Structure 1
């Protein structure tokens, strides 16, 4: 097929194809310590023919943690383990970005430092569930704990934690960093009027709601380089953990314009929740494309045909596939050859071990 398999310059690195591996939480890290494993290194290595791998969401700090089994990038042991994973990808001539998150109110007190309430823009429960582990280490669901609103004087420490995690990612050998500003996590909790009822300079107006994410962007650009920074947004639609308010399109375009001023490597748009949503209109895609001067990655139930169509139209540059990458380590070769895909086994997307993780065969 015609443009999916051609190179693309993505900030400081060049992808040999446009078939990207979306960030995918798999909840297989070691506890205690939230440490990446050899098995996770093998999983990533198997996928290194991707144009770019974007890692599972990774904590910037202990406080960022909201899921048992999700890895961090804040401790020495975590840095050491990730260095190995990046070295494995590089040994197979791949490229890998770390997605960095703070889960905010999508968390539980039992996995917070001190066992205390998690933090958010406002003290409003997400009214959803997260994943913990039981006494045998198996993934279980638990209702989210009501959070504590961050005090104004705590906000600089959040920005610093993102900055430090990006410094640690560089040390760890990642090619790029993806800020997780999507899916109702901390940055999005500030962005959304649904989850942010603050009356300080971090709530109310769109400019106030985007203030935190833009401070984080600035801090990480300064720490490393703008051509090493990507951002994931999900600014249109209703996600499990939050909606985008009553002026979603205008607010999205405001944010995107701001992000472009920073000259960052990429804009990754998660277009719908797993549960579905209204498709992006081509008019809205044009409006995004004229505001952002870097690479645009599209995601959300894409097929190869839709990817080619929108790439051919000059509307996006690359596609991130999530579940097809879970099941097909050599998704690039399969798409290039129009080969059949392995069937997905959703029961093993979260937790467990090798089964449903490293046992999906290549051609």
Structure 2
């Protein structure tokens, strides 16, 4: 039914509503956190997606928390991405870059100067990140305790998102997705759990949401609201960052503010309690742009919610890892390739560009 109809998402139009979710795969070149042609072949393979959303990409070297995640702050990086976006565009695809700062989800050993990473407050994420061993294989490691950002460092962060956005537009991407979910830097600010500041960036929900909203305004000035999407995970717990004691009302707060900027899309990452339709209707009521749902979605769950007018499209993660031509398969109701989780992270072409199409 509707899953395969067109949808305008800000400055682009997607041929269908089957989006490829951002997927950290950790195959970049170090030093330099540089995308590769292999990565290019991987994204090109999936260009039939209504929209491709790249793996999280550092806005800065300070943003880095995972060995192998690409950056978008250097000329080496921008040139490499250019080629990747070009490839997608040759296949008539569309590609958004998801930008993050990992904040406390990082390790000193991969920070500039071997320093502690930064966050809203000085509290261990109490989870793991992915680093590389001597042989360059991916390994899980306990995260380093962060340094709380000084008040006067915050403008530097906002500027980093702005500049990374300018770089996105230089590199060819059609859109930018702000990574404000999964317990990374923006979310570390949004959450009472990880934010214990007593300055204007802490306390009330308005204070906790200040950083993310200044990023949104900086990047709407820098480019356009029609080019900006944002990913939130506002209900539940993600990598040990919960959403505090009134998560639903605090979500509707941020969503109402987001609406005011008229940005292109709200990408809700789900997944542990499901979203009530009640809540879903409240979101749809407050936000006027494109709504993208993700998190253990099925083609059928997606077809429902869409028809019900509660979301406009769906991003598939794991299914996109394993099915380049996921779009065709969903429409032919074809079987999907088995997933190979042991190669989600790190490595080379095996479990990356070697999943076959129909």
Task: Output the TM-score relative to the length of structure 2.
Answer: 1.00
Equivalent pair of 1:59/1:101 in contact (CA under 8 Å): yes
What's the counterpart of residue 159 of structure 1? 158
What is the CA-CA distance between 1:241 and the residue it aligns to? 3.3
Secondary structure of residue in 2 paired with 1:4: helix
* CA distance in structure 1 between the aligned counterparts of 2:316 and 2:76, rounded to whole angstroms: 30
* CA distance in structure 2 between the aligned counterparts of 1:299 and 1:335, rounded to whole angstroms: 16
Q: What per-residue deviation string (whole Å, max 9, x for no partner) do you get for residues 148-169 of structure 1?
A: 0000000000000000000000
Equivalent pair of 1:189/1:196 in contact (CA under 8 Å): yes
My pick for the range that moved more, 6-15 or 240-249, is 240-249
What is the CA-CA distance between 1:283 and the residue it aligns to? 0.4
What is the CA-CA distance between 1:240 and the residue it aligns to? 1.6
What's the counterpart of residue 241 of structure 1? 240
1:194 aligns with 2:203: no
Q: What per-residue deviation string (whole Å, max 9, x for no partner) do you get for residues 274-299 of structure 1?
A: xxx20000000000000001000000
* CA distance in structure 1 between the aligned counterparts of 2:126 and 2:211, rounded to whole angstroms: 23
Equivalent pair of 1:231/1:267 in contact (CA under 8 Å): yes
* CA distance in structure 1 between the aligned counterparts of 2:281 and 2:273, rounded to whole angstroms: 17
Secondary structure of residue in 2 paired with 1:324: helix
What is the CA-CA distance between 1:351 and the residue it aligns to? 0.1
Equivalent pair of 1:106/1:241 in contact (CA under 8 Å): no
* CA distance in structure 2 between the aligned counterparts of 1:173 and 1:293, rounded to whole angstroms: 27
Equivalent pair of 1:52/1:94 in contact (CA under 8 Å): yes
* CA distance in structure 2 between the aligned counterparts of 1:4 and 1:170, rounded to whole angstroms: 29
* CA distance in structure 2 between the aligned counterparts of 1:216 and 1:307, rounded to whole angstroms: 30
* CA distance in structure 1 between the aligned counterparts of 2:18 and 2:140, rounded to whole angstroms: 32
* CA distance in structure 1 between the aligned counterparts of 2:96 and 2:59, rounded to whole angstroms: 14
The runs of 5 or more residues in structure 1 that have no matched partner are none
The runs of 5 or more residues in structure 2 that have no matched partner are none
Runs (4 or more) in structure 1 with deviation over 3 Å come to none
Q: What per-residue deviation string (whole Å, max 9, x for no partner) do you get for residues 282-338 of structure 1?
A: 000000000001000000000000000000000000000000000000000000100
Aligned pairs, number: 358
CA RMSD in angstroms, aligned pairs only? 0.4
* CA distance in structure 1 between the aligned counterparts of 2:246 and 2:182, rounded to whole angstroms: 18
Equivalent pair of 1:185/1:241 in contact (CA under 8 Å): no
What is the CA-CA distance between 1:174 and the residue it aligns to? 0.1
Task: Output the TM-score relative to the length of structure 1.
Answer: 0.98
What is the CA-CA distance between 1:205 and the residue it aligns to? 0.1
